[PDB]
Amino acid sequence: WGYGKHNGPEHWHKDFPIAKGERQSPVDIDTHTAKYDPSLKPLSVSYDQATSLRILNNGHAFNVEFDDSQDKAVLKGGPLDGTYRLIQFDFHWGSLDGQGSEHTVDKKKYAAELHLVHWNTKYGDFGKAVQQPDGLAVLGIFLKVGSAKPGLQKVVDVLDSIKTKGKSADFTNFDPRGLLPESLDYWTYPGSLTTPPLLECVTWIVLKEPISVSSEQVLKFRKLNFNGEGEPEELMVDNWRPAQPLKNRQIKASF
Ligand SMILES: [Zn+2]
């Protein structure tokens, strides 16, 4: 599976039938339709004690992994019950600035989309959590092109080291707090992973307020390769999945 003409999103349902399931992601967030729910609590992001280990090019994107053996980087509050631990953060981007985000707002597509993945500690490991309906929590942050994101630069400079599929690099002392917007106002709804196996185990929390990145930051993302080293070069662009039918589900807003 991939993002090309022959193995793209429109073909995933042949290997992964859940692809056409009842609670697929991403979705188009309709702001006039999203319901303001007063019973939603503020988000609780505790990331001061986070411990990054590495960055890798898994052939469909780049992931920064964290030590999730203890409650070091955690998410709680919001629509969530219990503590969810930070395991990884990844991005989805386009060939152009006009596309890249997975989630959309009023049909508006952003330059890229950052996902912070967390798993419910009640289930013991990441692999058990993806077998559950309340198994994961993904924080979605929209990136727009304007000014540079200081906090983003350490990631930017290491992409050269992981250009191709299978590459990884030591990535310690990275502080995720540098990627967060000023506001934690959000939208929430029940969905799934945006890549195979599209397990319908996620509680989405999409931040209203996007982060701005400079043109040159996003440019380095586009220099990544889908392919493995020693193979024809396929730029890693448009690694995003198109909006899926809402189908009954309701999107709640914390504002
Ligand atoms: Zn993602």
Side-chain angles (χ1 to χ4, degrees):
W1 67 270
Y3 295 89
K5 188 71 185 164
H6 290 110
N7 59 357
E10 68 282 346
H11 294 263
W12 311 341
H13 62 108
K14 290 168 285 162
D15 283 294
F16 305 102
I18 191 139
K20 14 186 157 212
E22 301 308 274
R23 72 177 268 180
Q24 289 290 282
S25 309
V27 312
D28 178 59
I29 298 160
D30 177 340
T31 69
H32 297 285
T33 249
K35 227 282 183 157
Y36 164 76
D37 175 7
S39 59
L40 274 44
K41 324 169 184 162
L43 273 172
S44 202
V45 178
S46 306
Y47 292 156
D48 49 294
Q49 218 68 238
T51 324
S52 67
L53 295 178
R54 52 114 89 155
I55 184 169
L56 82 168
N57 179 330
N58 71 20
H60 46 270
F62 69 85
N63 298 178
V64 166
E65 304 155 352
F66 290 80
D67 170 359
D68 67 349
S69 73
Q70 271 180 122
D71 281 9
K72 296 179 209 210
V74 307
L75 205 227
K76 47 188 167 34
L80 308 172
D81 294 310
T83 314
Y84 293 65
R85 301 180 181 160
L86 172 68
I87 195 186
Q88 59 164 95
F89 75 66
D90 62 276
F91 303 77
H92 297 266
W93 67 81
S95 45
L96 299 333
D97 302 344
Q99 66 190 40
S101 82
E102 284 200 306
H103 285 93
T104 55
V105 170
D106 290 331
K107 301 298 208 267
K108 168 174 170 59
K109 306 183 176 24
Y110 290 82
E113 178 173 332
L114 163 59
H115 296 138
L116 298 102
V117 188
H118 308 77
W119 62 265
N120 200 325
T121 73
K122 111 171 74 146
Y123 298 125
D125 61 79
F126 178 83
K128 292 320 195 171
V130 295
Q131 290 172 198
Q132 314 291 158
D134 60 345
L136 291 188
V138 191
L139 262 167
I141 293 159
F142 296 119
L143 281 64
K144 76 176 171 168
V145 185
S147 305
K149 184 58 160 167
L152 180 63
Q153 197 56 47
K154 287 186 52 144
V155 173
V156 158
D157 288 339
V158 78
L159 300 170
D160 275 334
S161 301
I162 68 156
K163 180 172 148 103
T164 65
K165 192 176 173 55
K167 297 298 192 195
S168 65
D170 299 339
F171 201 73
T172 54
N173 297 109
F174 185 76
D175 187 345
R177 277 179 296 178
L179 311 197
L180 301 184
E182 157 177 340
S183 202
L184 294 187
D185 284 331
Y186 71 88
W187 298 287
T188 186
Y189 78 101
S192 72
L193 294 176
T194 69
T195 72
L198 305 169
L199 307 171
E200 298 188 326
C201 70
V202 185
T203 287
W204 279 99
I205 304 163
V206 181
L207 279 48
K208 174 179 80 178
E209 178 179 352
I211 63 162
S212 64
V213 292
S214 79
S215 202
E216 25 279 308
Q217 296 183 299
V218 73
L219 269 183
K220 307 203 185 171
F221 288 25
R222 290 181 192 141
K223 274 161 140 167
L224 258 35
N225 297 172
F226 275 124
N227 70 279
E229 187 179 358
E231 314 180 346
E233 193 167 358
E234 184 176 359
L235 298 171
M236 182 186 299
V237 286
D238 302 319
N239 50 357
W240 46 273
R241 185 185 193 201
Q244 298 305 295
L246 195 51
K247 295 174 148 172
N248 89 221
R249 288 175 300 185
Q250 205 187 32
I251 300 171
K252 288 153 185 190
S254 73
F255 51 109

